Symmetry: C2
Subunit: 375 residues, 2 copies
């Protein structure tokens, strides 16, 4: 295996438009695979680090972690993947042999769990991307905004080769995070009520999960009212904008539902929203689930009696899905027509116009925009 | 049915010794039962309201809610109890026909749930106790520090008539609160580790529950080191006094257990302890359970990532036991030799020396002191 010269969308500077560059992609080392990306999409997380909003900024960098592609080659020690396999790169991995992977409960692999600071590969700490002999840094070990990328095999989910990669690429992050938050963690029973804070891809995945679970009432909470109408296609039965009410939103929800919803799922990462999501569930049997990741360090706060009145608060990561074990199953759920993905896709652009996907997201116009390589 | 003249231990004034008085006990009204108390014990909750520490103080008052006795008569509409039945009064009830009672998850009856302010009966708002025509107020609808008391039937658990009332009287509050907090809510699997904050009756019930569940490691946390040795009889494998460590106790526990315990149970009601109990459980699969009731209004606070790292926080009330449905079953657990109650009993006094039970508790010398009527 040798070096590949291809196109990648490089971020040279925070908040500036990506530039299509010719980059060089080194061959995969031990336990790595090199993937030809066919379709990729944009997630709020790409945007957050591209703006360098909070974290330690790292540039130049190739973003992107939602994608579908085909294995071009594998490094030594790789046995579960071969050239030609259809795959989804995942931003967090499953080594399959650590304490967390062995557990039935957790998907937080000690080897391969999400790391937003890391710009190089595990094996040697180096980037496989370069331009004129200078490193272009990785993002989440996936960097899918490139015609070719290199990814640790534990972060590569082999899927059904008949599944259309331009649809199921969105399964690798946002949608599955919400879907699993509901189906694996909240676990609403048939007939129950659910409140969902946030109506982006995670929230709409959570709603979709509640619909699949047979929830009879699904209340969407978002500050942008223009997200409301489309939300009904995902099973949301009514939407509430906290701005239209003087009362705290948890009180509004509790009055709507004679004491509160049976389940809630907080998908925005706002701490105030976490607090509201917890307090809006019913006493006795209410269960709140946090999945949105916060940008601030503000503490979760609440009066202890809210708990002693028999509420439960659960946090989850990536919907408690195991990347390699479970995600292929999620693709099947779509193949077998339980899961409806098409409605998540509101836009499509060629790789050459990738910056448009940023525009659509920053304007709140899109759910997911599919970016198509080779055009 | 007519009026009974008997002895009761009356509190006339906050923090002052109880006085044995001759009181009059009116006959039971609709859905009420009148009980001859044979054995009763003291709980920290009696003491807290007797000192009038926080709540709205109400005097004169007859305290006591842990007891075993025999039904003397029943009011109209009572069908599940008859004179001669062996019973345990419970501080919180089960009407059996409200939304909370119908639920599989909750024991927070809409009709009969704990009320610490109420000095009279539900039916008419009046007390059945009097001295010289003046009311002596009820406590938790049980008031068991009297040779005879009147209690709503929903708060009266008929139990096995062969069970010794001078042992199983402690089953009606503290012990069962802890036992159930562990067995019904924490639900530790065989081999797991458990941290228990507080080594009073609730904590020792929680420990006993963890032992019964087959926990391999049970770590007791209490500020009073003299509670440690006796705790081993309850299954505690080691004890830790936060005062002997510079590090925060949740860090100490996490270092003892390679990341934290599998389960924790907070039994003191200290808010700081609730925070520590939550943070000391392991990421991925850790579950913390709050059951101790706070005396202050301080908020529970913690960094949200502690949740998103896949921790779970559960609050419970009375160990999630249904008073009438489950508590008789707990007595059987003792009859069938699964549950060991004798070790909870460290003292015994006659009703005439009831104030001694207060002394033993205030000196931290006792777990439970049995008070015996008729002497
Ligand atoms: Zn692993
Ligand atoms: Zn994402
Ligand atoms: Zn009820
Ligand atoms: Zn008590």
């Amino acid at each position: 295996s040798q070096i590949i010269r291809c196109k990648a969308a490089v971020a040279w500077e925070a908040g500036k438009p990506l530039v299509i560059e010719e980059v060089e992609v080194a061959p995969p080392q031990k336990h790595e695979v090199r993937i030809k990306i066919l379709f990729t999409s944009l997630c709020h997380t790409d945007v957050y680090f591209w703006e360098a909003k909070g974290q330690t900024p790292l540039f130049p960098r190739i973003f992107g972690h939602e994608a579908g592609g085909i294995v071009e080659s594998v490094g030594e020690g790789v046995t579960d993947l071969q050239p030609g396999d259809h795959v989804l790169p995942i931003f967090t991995g499953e080594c399959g042999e650590c304490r967390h992977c062995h557990s039935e409960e957790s998907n937080m692999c000690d080897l391969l769990r999400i790391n937003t600071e890391r710009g190089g590969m595990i094996h040697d700490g180096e980037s496989r991307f370069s331009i004129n002999g200078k490193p272009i840094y990785h993002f989440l070990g996936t960097s899918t905004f490139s015609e070719y990328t290199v990814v640790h095999s534990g972060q590569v989910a082999k899927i059904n080769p008949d599944a259309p990669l331009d649809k199921v690429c969105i399964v690798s992050c946002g949608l599955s995070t919400g879907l699993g938050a509901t189906l694996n963690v909240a676990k609403p029973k048939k007939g129950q009520s659910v409140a969902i804070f946030g109506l982006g891809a995670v929230g709409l995945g959570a709603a979709e999960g509640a619909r699949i679970a047979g929830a009879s009432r699904i209340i969407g909470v978002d500050f942008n009212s223009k997200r409301f109408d489309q939300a009904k296609e995902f099973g949301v039965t009514e939407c509430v904008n906290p701005k239209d009410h003087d009362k705290p939103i948890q009180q509004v929800i509790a009055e709507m539902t004679d004491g509160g919803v049976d389940r809630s799922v907080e998908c925005t990462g706002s701490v105030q929203a976490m607090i509201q999501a917890f307090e809006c569930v019913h006493d006795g049997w209410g269960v709140a689930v946090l999945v949105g990741v916060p940008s601030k360090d503000d503490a979760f706060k609440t009066h202890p009696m809210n708990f002693l009145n028999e509420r439960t608060l659960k946090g989850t990561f990536f919907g408690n899905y195991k990347p390699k074990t479970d995600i292929p199953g999620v693709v099947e759920k779509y193949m077998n027509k339980e899961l409806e993905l098409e409605k998540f896709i509101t836009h499509t652009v060629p790789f050459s116009e990738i910056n448009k996907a940023f525009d659509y997201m920053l304007k709140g116009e899109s759910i997911r925009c599919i970016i198509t390589m080779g055009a």
